[PDB]
Amino acid sequence: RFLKVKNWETDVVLTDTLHLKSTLETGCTEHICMGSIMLPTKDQLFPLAKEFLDQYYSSIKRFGSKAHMDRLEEVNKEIESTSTYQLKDTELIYGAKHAWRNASRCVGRIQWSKLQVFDARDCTTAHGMFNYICNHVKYATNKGNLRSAITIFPQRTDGKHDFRVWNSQLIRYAGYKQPDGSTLGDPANVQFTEICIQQGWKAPRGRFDVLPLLLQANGNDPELFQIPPELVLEVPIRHPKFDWFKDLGLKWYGLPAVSNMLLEIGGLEFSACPFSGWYMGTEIGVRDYCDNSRYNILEEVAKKMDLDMRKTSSLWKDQALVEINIAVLYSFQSDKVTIVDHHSATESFIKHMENEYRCRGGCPADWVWIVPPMSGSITPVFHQEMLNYRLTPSFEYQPDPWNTHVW
Amino acid sequence: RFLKVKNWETDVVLTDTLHLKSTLETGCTEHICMGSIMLPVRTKDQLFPLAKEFLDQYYSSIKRFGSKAHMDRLEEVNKEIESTSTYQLKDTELIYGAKHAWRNASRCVGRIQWSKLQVFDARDCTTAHGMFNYICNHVKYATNKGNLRSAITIFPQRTDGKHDFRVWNSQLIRYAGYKQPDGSTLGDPANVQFTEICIQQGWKAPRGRFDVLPLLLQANGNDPELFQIPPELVLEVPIRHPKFDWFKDLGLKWYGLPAVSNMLLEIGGLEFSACPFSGWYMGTEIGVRDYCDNSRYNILEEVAKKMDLDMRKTSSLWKDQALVEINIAVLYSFQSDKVTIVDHHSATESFIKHMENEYRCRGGCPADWVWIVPPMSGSITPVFHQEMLNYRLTPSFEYQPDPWNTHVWKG
Numbered sequence: 082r083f084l085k086v087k088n089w090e091t092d093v094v095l096t097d098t099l100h101l102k103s104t105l106e107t108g109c110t111e112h113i114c115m116g117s118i119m120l121p122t123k124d125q126l127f128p129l130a131k132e133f134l135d136q137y138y139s140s141i142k143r144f145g146s147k148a149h150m151d152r153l154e155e156v157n158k159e160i161e162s163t164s165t166y167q168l169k170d171t172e173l174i175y176g177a178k179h180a181w182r183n184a185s186r187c188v189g190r191i192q193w194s195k196l197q198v199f200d201a202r203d204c205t206t207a208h209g210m211f212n213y214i215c216n217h218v219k220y221a222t223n224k225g226n227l228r229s230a231i232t233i234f235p236q237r238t239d240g241k242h243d244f245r246v247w248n249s250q251l252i253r254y255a256g257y258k259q260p261d262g263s264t265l266g267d268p269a270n271v272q273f274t275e276i277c278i279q280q281g282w283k284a285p286r287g288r289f290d291v292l293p294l295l296l297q298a299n300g301n302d303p304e305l306f307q308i309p310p311e312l313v314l315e316v317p318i319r320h321p322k323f324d325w326f327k328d329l330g331l332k333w334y335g336l337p338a339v340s341n342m343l344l345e346i347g348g349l350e351f352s353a354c355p356f357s358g359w360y361m362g363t364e365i366g367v368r369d370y371c372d373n374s375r376y377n378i379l380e381e382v383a384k385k386m387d388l389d390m391r392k393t394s395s396l397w398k399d400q401a402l403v404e405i406n407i408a409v410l411y412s413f414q415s416d417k418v419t420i421v422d423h424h425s426a427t428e429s430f431i432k433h434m435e436n437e438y439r440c441r442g443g444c445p446a447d448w449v450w451i452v453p454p455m456s457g458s459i460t461p462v463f464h465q466e467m468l469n470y471r472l473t474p475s476f477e478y479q480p481d482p483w484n485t486h487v488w
Numbered sequence: 489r490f491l492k493v494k495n496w497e498t499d500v501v502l503t504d505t506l507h508l509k510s511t512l513e514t515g516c517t518e519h520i521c522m523g524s525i526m527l528p529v530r531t532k533d534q535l536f537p538l539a540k541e542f543l544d545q546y547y548s549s550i551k552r553f554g555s556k557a558h559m560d561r562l563e564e565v566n567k568e569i570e571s572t573s574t575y576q577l578k579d580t581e582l583i584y585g586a587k588h589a590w591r592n593a594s595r596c597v598g599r600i601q602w603s604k605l606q607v608f609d610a611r612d613c614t615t616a617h618g619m620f621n622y623i624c625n626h627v628k629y630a631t632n633k634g635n636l637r638s639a640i641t642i643f644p645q646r647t648d649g650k651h652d653f654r655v656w657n658s659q660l661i662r663y664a665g666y667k668q669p670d671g672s673t674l675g676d677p678a679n680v681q682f683t684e685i686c687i688q689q690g691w692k693a694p695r696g697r698f699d700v701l702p703l704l705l706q707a708n709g710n711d712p713e714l715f716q717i718p719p720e721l722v723l724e725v726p727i728r729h730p731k732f733d734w735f736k737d738l739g740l741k742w743y744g745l746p747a748v749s750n751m752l753l754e755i756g757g758l759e760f761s762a763c764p765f766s767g768w769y770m771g772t773e774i775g776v777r778d779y780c781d782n783s784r785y786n787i788l789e790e791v792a793k794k795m796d797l798d799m800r801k802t803s804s805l806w807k808d809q810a811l812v813e814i815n816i817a818v819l820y821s822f823q824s825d826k827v828t829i830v831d832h833h834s835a836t837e838s839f840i841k842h843m844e845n846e847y848r849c850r851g852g853c854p855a856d857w858v859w860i861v862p863p864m865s866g867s868i869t870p871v872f873h874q875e876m877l878n879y880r881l882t883p884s885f886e887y888q889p890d891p892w893n894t895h896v897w898k899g
């Protein structure tokens with residue numbers, strides 16, 4: 082019932098007790114492990130509400146106190162009467178931060194307590210959503226000195242009235258399928274891009290076209306808006322030693338900001354809750370540039386480096402992969418946009434695991450997502466055993482709305 | 489029941505039915521995943537069902553399920569278990585069982601090769617000297633002057649668990665480690681403890697950076713005894729780099745034969761506690777782990793120094809640059825000497841084809857993602873994007889605690 086995690090590099094052993102507060106199902110049984118799988122009523126609500134408020138009042142050193150019980154009562158009366166309830170601001174800030182703290186797939190949680198929360202619960206239209214979003218983008222970007230933030234729109238009601246940001250991230254590049262057969266821009270977005278023009282976007286049909294936001298307010302058909310160009314901070318990609326690099330015409334955006342997830346606090350569901358921090362270098366350099374299904378530029382780069390591409394064992398993919406990543410780090414650093422390397426990020430996360438075991442009795446961590454997609458075993462997280470379990474408040478992946486929604 | 493795995497690069501979706509034949513526990517629950525935890529005397533009562541499952545499997549595979557031959561063998565094994573409380577595998581059973589332990593090993597990326605395995609039956613062995621000779625012939629046949637062949641040697645099964653055969657080495661060929669009084673280590677820090685046991689047992693240590701350890705062999709539950717593998721039998725490759733002429737002066741070399749000797753082989757409920765097996769290396773096991781783990785030879789600093797990389801900031805990716813170069817050197821050195829080796833690109837592509845063939849032909853392929861994805865260049869290999877199900881089939885290879893912890897010393 083109490084569980085050990087060992088680091089095989091340092092021999093440090095940690096004891097996890099936090100997992101018995103785990104509630105949700107993980108996808109694994111005694112018979113099958115699904116560690117590597119990407120997607121494994123009034124009655125139901127008050128347990129959830131109670132459980133959250135209990136942890137809330139516990140964290141403010143006020144468990145079992147008058148203010149505590151009074152709130153539990155107020156919330157109970159409200160559920161019994163209205164079919165749901167409203168979070169107080171303090172609870173909302175606590176909820177959001179803890180959802181980040183519980184995010185087992187996030188390497189950057191050392192930062193979890195420094196999260197600016199924008200309460201957009203008074204929002205009522207998509208124009209309103211647009212306005213809240215621009216302000217988020219601008220506050221977070223901060224001329225390159227990036228700041229963690231989240232913006233929280235109205236919670237689920239009867240479920241026919243959801244708020245949703247159709248985009249998967251606030252800022253992403255367009256993708257178009259061409260007559261010659263290939264793909265221009267980002268192949269991850271062909272589908273969404275198509276829906277954009279189908280709803281009326283004047284696509285420039287270029288390679289690095291910042292997509293338009295598609296916002297659904299109050300379960301209504303979604304609407305189009307361009308983020309003011311001057312709010313999207315982009316970085317042109319150059320190498321500190323390879324002068325030809327620039328000529329590939331590579332840029333990326335400074336602000337990673339995930340906008341398809343669902344935040345669950347005390348059993349209430351916030352379906353639109355874009356959040357943003359700052360990039361770990363490998364995310365652009367390894368995944369966005371080098372994935373076969375993405376920009377897929379290894380071949381081009383290896384060529385310019387005059388490497389032996391005749392056989393896999395010359396490790397030309399690997400050599401090129403590293404330089405592409407050196408270039409992403411250099412560029413962001415030279416233009417003074419916050420970015421973190423995988424060595425630094427994973428080191429910070431180990432320090433953070435130690436803190437969470439010391440101070441909380443554990444840290445849910447998903448090793449498959451935490452170990453970077455390059456140079457795994459030279460980073461310390463490779464050698465660290467992790468327990469993965471689901472705590473609330475949480476972030477949850479939700480299905481692309483277009484698959485669902487009717488017009 | 490059905491279970492789907494998707495590949496996120498190709499969108500290819502596979503369907504696993506084989507997990508339905510899964511027995512042992514994983515260590516995971518509906519509330520906790522332990523997929524990244526390294527580690528998550530048998531009664532008559534429990535043995536006949538395990539013999540029965542296995543022989544049902546064996547006879548299905550040779551297309552004789554339900555034959556007289558099958559039914560007679562069931563009855564015969566039933567009888568041995570009744571009378572002697574264990575049983576003996578036929579040669580054909582042992583061979584099939586050893587091949588399947590490999591096939592079922594979910595942490596092994598090399599399984600496209602599972603059906604080409606040389607089985608050396610050493611179940612007539614009685615002494616450590618006998619074990620030494622069996623092991624020598626294994627090393628020599630497996631090496632084959634650089635053209636490596638997969639092989640396994642199987643010593644007699646557990647009886648009362650008081651008479652176990654064990655190879656105390658974790659691999660047949662490994663380098664010594666020596667802790668210095670200043671706190672540093674000479675040779676392989678991974679083998680310090682075992683090196684000490686060897687020294688305590690009588691070995692005269694050369695005290696160099698690349699000393700091949702002596703075998704330490706237990707037969708019949710007896711205290712183990714030391715033997716030196718004939719040096720002419722230990723094929724080694726000096727490490728050099730194709731463009732960097734200074735690389736050779738680092739002094740590195742490595743052995744050609746990866747041979748795991750610390751695992752327990754389970755077949756039809758029988759336990760084979762000494763069963764060293766060997767294949768050939770994937771380059772990253774040497775170049776990433778052996779040389780670049782901080783707890784191992786740890787040559788990163790030294791390589792980047794000589795490369796004159798900028799080492800003031802981790803964000804120069806100097807560690808990453810040195811890593812690739814060392815791994816280029818390993819593959820180059822092995823290929824130049826005609827010693828079998830496989831790079832991680834080729835090994836993972838081959839594994840993905842094996843996996844797909846396995847889903848078509850068998851209804852699944854249990855796979856441990858954490859172990860199968862290489863420890864460098866993760867996502868530029870096709871396995872990174874592959875969903876995998878991990879579960880446990882028999883026959884199988886299981887981890888054993890080191891014998892020096894459990895062994896009853898006789899004197």
Ligand code: HEM
Pocket residue numbers: 180181184186187188189190192196229230231339356357358359360361364421426450476478
């Ligand atoms: C401040 C710097 C941050 C760093 C360096 C960072 C690091 C990362 C990385 C590298 C990933 C992998 C994403 C992928 O592979 O697509 C990730 C995932 C994630 N992070 Fe963070 N994070 C940061 C801030 C945040 C914030 C502000 C939140 C929410 C408040 C958050 C919550 C999450 C969640 C829920 C995931 C999983 C997303 C998914 O399932 O696709 N992180 N984190």
Ligand code: HEM
Pocket residue numbers: 586590593595596597598599601605638639640765766767768769770773830835885887
């Ligand atoms: C033919 C060439 C082979 C290649 C390229 C290969 C590849 C690998 C690699 C790279 C590992 C992980 C090494 C580690 O992290 O310690 C591994 C693990 C393993 N392989 Fe293989 N393999 C081969 C042959 C074999 C053979 C002949 C067997 C037994 C018949 C085998 C059974 C295993 C087992 C049981 C593990 C997990 C070991 C553990 O838990 O420590 N493999 N394989």
Ligand SMILES: Cc1cccc([C@@H]2C[C@H]2NCCO[C@H]2CNC[C@H]2Cc2cc(C)cc(N)n2)c1
Pocket residue numbers: 119120250337338339356357358359360361364478
């Ligand atoms: C807030 C923050 C900080 C640092 C970095 C980020 C980067 C932007 C986050 N990455 C976006 C790319 O996301 C794709 C790739 N990894 C899983 C997919 C998204 C995804 C897909 C599916 C099926 C499930 C799931 N949970 N996530 C975000």
Ligand SMILES: Cc1cccc([C@@H]2C[C@H]2NCCO[C@H]2CNC[C@H]2Cc2cc(C)cc(N)n2)c1
Pocket residue numbers: 526527598659746747748765766767768769770773887
């Ligand atoms: C047959 C064959 C072919 C190719 C490569 C091999 C590689 C050489 C074998 N690797 C040996 C070093 O092994 C350490 C490091 N990876 C797991 C540990 C051993 C280990 C430790 C623990 C706690 C559990 C476990 N199951 N294995 C074998």
Ligand SMILES: C[C@H](O)[C@H](O)[C@H]1CNc2nc(N)[nH]c(=O)c2N1
Pocket residue numbers: 116117118119449450451496872873874875876
């Ligand atoms: C199937 C496998 O889980 C999938 O490719 C994962 C692996 N690890 C990952 N890790 C991160 N951070 N992000 C990802 O998108 C993935 N993809």
Ligand SMILES: C[C@H](O)[C@H](O)[C@H]1CNc2nc(N)[nH]c(=O)c2N1
Pocket residue numbers: 089463464465466467523524525526858859860
């Ligand atoms: C903690 C974690 O399970 C451990 O470091 C694993 C990760 N992946 C591995 N993969 C392989 N092939 N071999 C290993 O020894 C390990 N070690």
Ligand SMILES: [Zn+2]
Pocket residue numbers: 109113114115116516520521522523
């Ligand atoms: Zn699991």
